[PDB]
Design a protein around this ligand. Structure first.
Ligand SMILES: Nc1ncnc2c1ncn2[C@@H]1O[C@H](COP(=O)(O)OP(=O)(O)OP(=O)(O)O)[C@@H](O)[C@H]1O
Ligand SMILES: [Mg+2]
Ligand SMILES: [Mn+2]
Length: 535
């Protein structure tokens, strides 16, 4: 695929061993090499999958994310210093120092080079070349990106390079005004991502997602943090939501063909996956509740940060290394998928998932057109942050478009293209609370799946509704397979008064958050679709 001389063109010198397009069999034996030390080491589990520890980082490091500010990006990027976001500006000169750190780190090493695609469609996909010195990092990108055919490899021409220098750090970070010795940096003039300090594989996956989020909407294509699936009739659904809200869990549905679990575009022909694999959360994983995900954990899946007992069994309940235990697998580890290309027609059902730790929002509501835009821009979820200290400190997150950490353009640009696509398809939107109600427990997966079924088969559209105060959400009066009591969140408190107190707290949070969008005529008009609180 490439010679040591081609790598020298990238700045990487004296590479003696090049592993181009490593096979799954080679990656397995690389990860289990008994002479490996530290965080490169894998262990074989009784399910047949290799498990690794990703080091000090067990999630992304948004405080270390930087984008070079130059004549290509200055007037188009959504900059952190010009709404809150992580797109912090970096100079071209400082970029050159970070590039030197990474290229020197990879020089004189045995390198894995993985060529892959981001985007299922040839007309808009990125041809990405990933370079790493850690086998399980190469395995991660083999699982998560689209694996080219032999014919596509023969004429592969990268238009983005990702250089993973996890083992290096930046000793000049203080004088350079950066956050730490680690860095995840992007340059759209050179079309490159550099990683230093963090080994975490998802920096590469979400890094390329951020690049698609820059390029696609500028060409009229929606770029979405959502899962997607399709029914027997060809009816497509997309599921937006922040991390942990259910996109992967609920899209992996035995009644539907999976398109993808996390990153999709929506062009003139329909909805298409960016990825070649899925990246499931494994904390407290239940084979009974999530059988398809559980079954995908086998040879060629890559487990991250799980606890493996001495006998090789996995303690999926153990969050000691992190609550964000994960498994990646190529998408064909799921039985019922769209193939050979992960794409389908236009979505007619658009589901916003949220996990409301305030216990206010109903399990399901059908949204008006204006409420759809209001809630898309708000991008709400919440967490019980204080659990380890024995308290419910519901902590809100408002992350525009249900994925602000990955947005490269202003939120209104994603909203505009999404609305355009939804209006052309006649799509309807729904808000689903996969989180908490007055019981202080999350709604069960079984009940949420039944809610999703009722959305997808048209049942919910055919129901009578009542209106929830404050948020003015249309809720169905009944739904097949779900206890009617929980459809109204007020019923899970000893009295509507307990819900009302929490609803007022949450409404104020939404109203304060939305204020930043009211600087345009269209945004000010959307306030009427948000929660109403005047006392
Ligand atoms: N009612 C529910 N619906 C969906 N998931 C639930 C529910 N109750 C508990 N869970 C748990 O919530 C988590 C949902 O995580 P999931 O991996 O689907 O999130 P995600 O939206 O795909 O996030 P990410 O974008 O970070 O991958 C899982 O751990 C799942 O078992
Ligand atoms: Mg997911
Ligand atoms: Mn995600």
């Amino acid at each position: 695929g490439l010679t040591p001389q081609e790598l020298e063109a990238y700045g990487i010198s004296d590479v003696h061993d090049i592993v181009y397009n490593p096979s799954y069999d080679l990656l397995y034996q690389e990860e289990l090499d008994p002479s490996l030390t530290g965080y490169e080491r894998g262990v074989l589990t009784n399910l047949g999958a290799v498990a690794v520890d990703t080091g000090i980082f067990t999630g992304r490091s948004p405080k270390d994310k930087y984008i070079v500010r130059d004549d290509t990006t200055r007037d188009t990027f959504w900059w952190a210093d010009k709404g809150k976001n992580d797109n912090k500006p970096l100079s071209p000169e400082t970029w050159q120092h970070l590039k030197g750190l990474v290229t020197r780190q990879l020089s004189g090493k045995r390198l894995f080079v993985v060529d892959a695609f981001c985007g299922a469609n040839p007309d808009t996909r990125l041809s990405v070349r990933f370079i790493t010195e850690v086998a399980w990092q190469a395995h991660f990108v083999k699982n998560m990106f689209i694996r080219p055919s032999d014919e596509e490899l023969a004429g592969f021409k990268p238009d983005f390079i990702v250089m993973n220098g996890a083992k290096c750090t930046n000793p000049q970070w203080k004088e350079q005004g950066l956050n730490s010795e680690n860095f995840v940096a992007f340059n759209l003039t050179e079309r490159m991502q550099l990683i230093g300090g963090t080994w975490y594989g998802n920096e590469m996956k979400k890094g390329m997602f951020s690049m698609m989020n820059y390029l696609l909407p500028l060409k009229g294509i929606a770029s979405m943090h959502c899962s997607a699936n399709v029914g027997e009739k060809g009816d497509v659904a997309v599921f937006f939501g922040l991390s942990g809200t259910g996109k992967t869990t609920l899209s992996t549905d035995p009644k539907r063909r999976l398109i993808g679990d996390d990153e999709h575009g929506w062009d003139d022909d329909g909805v298409f996956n960016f990825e070649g694999g899925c990246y499931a959360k494994t904390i407290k994983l239940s084979k009974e509740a999530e059988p398809e995900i559980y079954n995908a954990i086998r040879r060629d899946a890559l487990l991250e940060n799980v606890t493996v007992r001495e006998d090789g069994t996995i303690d999926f309940d153990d969050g000691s290394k992190t609550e964000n235990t994960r498994v990646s697998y190529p998408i064909y580890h799921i039985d019922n998928i769209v193939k050979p290309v992960s794409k389908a027609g236009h979505a007619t059902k658009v589901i916003f998932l949220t996990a409301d730790a305030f216990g206010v929002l109903p399990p399901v509501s059908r949204l008006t057109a204006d409420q759809t835009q209001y809630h898309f821009l708000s991008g709400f979820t919440a967490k019980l942050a204080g659990t380890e200290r024995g308290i419910t400190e519901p902590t809100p997150t408002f992350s525009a478009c249900f994925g602000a950490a990955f947005l490269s353009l202003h939120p209104t640009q994603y909203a505009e293209v999404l609305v355009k696509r939804m209006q052309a398809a006649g799509a309807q939107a729904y808000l689903v609370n996969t989180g908490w109600n007055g019981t202080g427990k999350r709604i069960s997966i079984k009940d949420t799946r039944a809610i999703i079924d009722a959305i997808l088969n048209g049942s919910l559209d055919n129901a009578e509704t009542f209106t929830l105060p404050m948020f003015n959400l249309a809720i169905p009066t009944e739904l097949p397979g779900v206890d009617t009591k929980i459809l109204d969140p007020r019923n899970t408190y000893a009295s509507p008064e307990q819900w009302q107190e929490k609803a007022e707290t949450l409404a104020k949070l939404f109203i304060d958050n939305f204020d930043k969008y009211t600087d345009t005529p269209a945004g000010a008009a959307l306030v009427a679709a948000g929660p109403k609180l005047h006392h």
